[PDB]
Amino acid sequence: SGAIYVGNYRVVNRHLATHNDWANLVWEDSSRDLLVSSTTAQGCDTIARCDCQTGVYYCSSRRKHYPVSFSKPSLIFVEASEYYPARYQSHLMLAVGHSEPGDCGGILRCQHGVVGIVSTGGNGLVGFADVRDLLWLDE
Numbered sequence: 001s002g003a004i005y006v007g008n009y010r011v012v013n014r015h016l017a018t019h020n021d022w023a024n025l026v027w028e029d030s031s032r033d034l035l036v037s038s039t040t041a042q043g044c045d046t047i048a049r050c051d052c053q054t055g056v057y058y059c060s061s062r063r064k065h066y067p068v069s070f071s072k073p074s075l076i077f078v079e080a081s082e083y084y085p086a087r088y089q090s091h092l093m094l095a096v097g098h099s100e101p102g103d104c105g106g107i108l109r110c111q112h113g114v115v116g117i118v119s120t121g122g123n124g125l126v127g128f129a130d131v132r133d134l135l136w137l138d139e
């Protein structure tokens with residue numbers, strides 16, 4: 001679990017969005033596993049606007065942060081799960097690192113701010129949904 005809180009927006013994994021997220025929907029994209037909802041309170045986070053390919057992520061299943069080298073956002077095949085059919089997930093960045101069910105929503109940060117959130121895992125890999133291209137989150 002986990003979310004990004006920026007301005008009057010909450011960014012969560014689309015497959016973990018709540019009834020309240022859907023009632024206050026701003027934007028969602030099944031191919032990216034992202035959903036953004038509106039909030040009444042001002043958020044605690046800053047979004048990176050950069051091309052970093054190194055950063056640190058929080059892994060809830062280890063209660064630890066880990067440094068990672070990750071690929072640029074791209075279209076990657078993801079196996080069918082209870083949440084989605086087998087499909088290509090877009091804007092996804094992969095890295096070598098631990099990730100298991102429950103780690104979705106952990107934040108990946110670089111020196112410039114929030115880069116994205118955990119969205120996929122298994123086999124000693126961790127995949128992050130990028131948010132750096134969503135410039136409207138800043139306004």
Ligand SMILES: NC(=O)[C@H]1CCCN(C(=O)[C@@H](Sc2ccccc2)c2ccccc2)C1
Pocket residue numbers: 015033078079081083084089099100101102103104118119120121122123
């Ligand atoms: N479509 C998606 O964005 C995800 C929805 C939930 C299921 N997805 C996963 O990747 C799963 S279990 C997995 C393990 C090995 C190979 C494939 C999947 C998982 C594991 C670790 C962290 C987060 C999620 C895909």
Ligand SMILES: [Zn+2]
Pocket residue numbers: 048049050051052110111112113
């Ligand atoms: Zn950066």
